């Protein structure tokens, strides 16, 4: 949350000079194929352009918030990168049907279909449907699921 | 002749319960905690609090008129320890000291056949 305080504020400043710990500065500058790669790497790498100057152990790092902010909702992206970054070494299909992840996700889906009014069937996922298998269908539909969290891009 | 009560002493590391009713657990008669008798938090399970609490239970049993009493004592049981702590022993000393008649002293601690995992992990739990 050290960079979260300067990623979403109103009236973003010109520059940002600051000293942090060096390993978080490695997390903001981590390549996607690394074990040092994390969620906050993606958070800076499409919300806050960042590079390392003035190595002090501590590190100085420089941040700039992109004033044409790309239209990505932070809540859903933050939640999905959290639930695929906590299970970093695991895959993505079986990790969602966890115990209580598989309550809160279809709570988010039922609020997501509250303005859509989609009919929830009696088929609903334990054999072939939305709590269990349509999640697998829509991760098959995109670039995720089999490619792990240390390989997927933005 | 007399009327016997059914007594329970529950001895944790951090309090004591002196809790008694009549036969078959019908309706609870006297009910004390370690926290209500000494307001110091370091002395919740003190033997002083145990004897004063059991003395107040004995006063409750005397004003309802029960003279004899049957007692069983226990720890938490299960994954934690089996025999009661010394707060229970001081409670026994207090209830015998109170002049109330005692009927039977046993140890109904809930003992597992085969327990589950305790709340410490591999390394250990106490300090």
């Amino acid at each position: 949350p050290l960079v979260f305080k300067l990623i979403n504020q109103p009236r973003p400043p010109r520059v940002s000079i600051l000293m942090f710990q060096r390993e978080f500065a490695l997390r903001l500058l981590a390549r996607p194929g690394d074990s040092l790669y994390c969620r906050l790497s993606a958070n800076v790498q499409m919300w806050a352009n960042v590079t390392h100057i003035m190595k002090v152990e501590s590190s100085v790092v420089r941040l700039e918030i992109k004033n044409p902010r790309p239209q990505v909702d932070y809540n859903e992206w933050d939640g999905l990168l959290r639930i695929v970054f906590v299970r970093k070494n695991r895959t993505i299909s079986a990790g969602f049907k966890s115990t209580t992840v598989m309550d809160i996700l279809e709570k988010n889906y039922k609020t997501f279909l509250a303005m859509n009014n989609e009919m929830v069937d009696d088929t609903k996922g334990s054999m072939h449907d939305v709590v269990k298998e349509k999640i697998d269908t829509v991760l098959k539909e995109t670039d995720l699921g089999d490619k792990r969290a240390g390989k997927c891009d933005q | 002749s007399q009327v016997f009560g059914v007594a329970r002493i529950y001895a944790s590391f951090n309090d004591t319960f002196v809790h008694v009713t009549d036969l078959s657990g019908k309706e609870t008669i006297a009910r004390v905690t370690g926290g209500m008798k000494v307001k110091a938090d370091r002395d919740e399970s003190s033997p002083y609090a145990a004897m004063l609490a059991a003395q107040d239970v004995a006063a409750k049993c005397k004003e309802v008129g029960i003279t004899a009493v049957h007692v069983k004592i226990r720890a938490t049981g299960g994954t934690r320890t089996k025999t009661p702590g010394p707060g229970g022993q001081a409670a026994l000393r207090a209830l015998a000291r109170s002049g109330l008649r005692i009927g039977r002293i046993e140890d109904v601690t809930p003992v597992p056949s085969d327990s589950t995992r305790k709340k410490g992990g591999r390394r250990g739990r106490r300090l």
């Binding site: - | 078959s24 046993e106 140890d107 109904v108 601690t109 003992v111």
Partner: protein, 148 residues
């Protein structure tokens, strides 16, 4: 003992189960003998469903030199077969009043003692603990006959 019926501030009470005190079991288990547990699932003549747990052991004889008296596993299986047969025929040949009337003078473990003396010397035999499992359709006159 379980309470069932009211007779003017006086209460009828029925049989529910038997147990020992736990300190009896704590003293009672020896570190140098073999413990036998035998269990049988029981339906009774008076339509109760019951569970009987009997415990048997291994003695020192009067001539022993051995500091431990263990038993082989086929011996243990034979004694467990014998305890299951004695308990099964004993509870089938009787009803609840005769079960209580044979619990008090220790007739059952005497039958164990002289019926297992051909297999192994056995000591400190008692049924430890009595469970009711199924209660039938509720009667009235049989319970006052038990009271009478």
């Amino acid at each position: 003992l379980r309470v069932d019926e009211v007779q003017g501030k006086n209460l009828l009470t029925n049989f529910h189960g038997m147990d020992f005190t736990t300190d009896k079991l704590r003293s009672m288990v020896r570190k140098w003998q073999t413990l036998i547990e035998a269990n049988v699932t029981v339906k009774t003549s008076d339509d109760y469903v019951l569970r009987i747990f009997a415990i048997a052991f291994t003695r020192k004889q009067a001539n022993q030199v051995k500091r431990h008296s263990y038993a082989q596993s086929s011996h243990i299986r034979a004694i467990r077969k014998v305890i299951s047969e004695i308990l099964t025929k004993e509870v089938q040949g009787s009803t609840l009043a005769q079960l209580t009337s044979k619990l008090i003078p220790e007739v059952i473990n005497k039958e164990i003692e002289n019926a297992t003396k051909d297999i192994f010397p056995l000591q400190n035999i008692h049924v430890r603990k009595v469970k009711l499992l199924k209660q039938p359709k509720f009667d009235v006159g049989a319970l006052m006959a038990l009271h009478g």
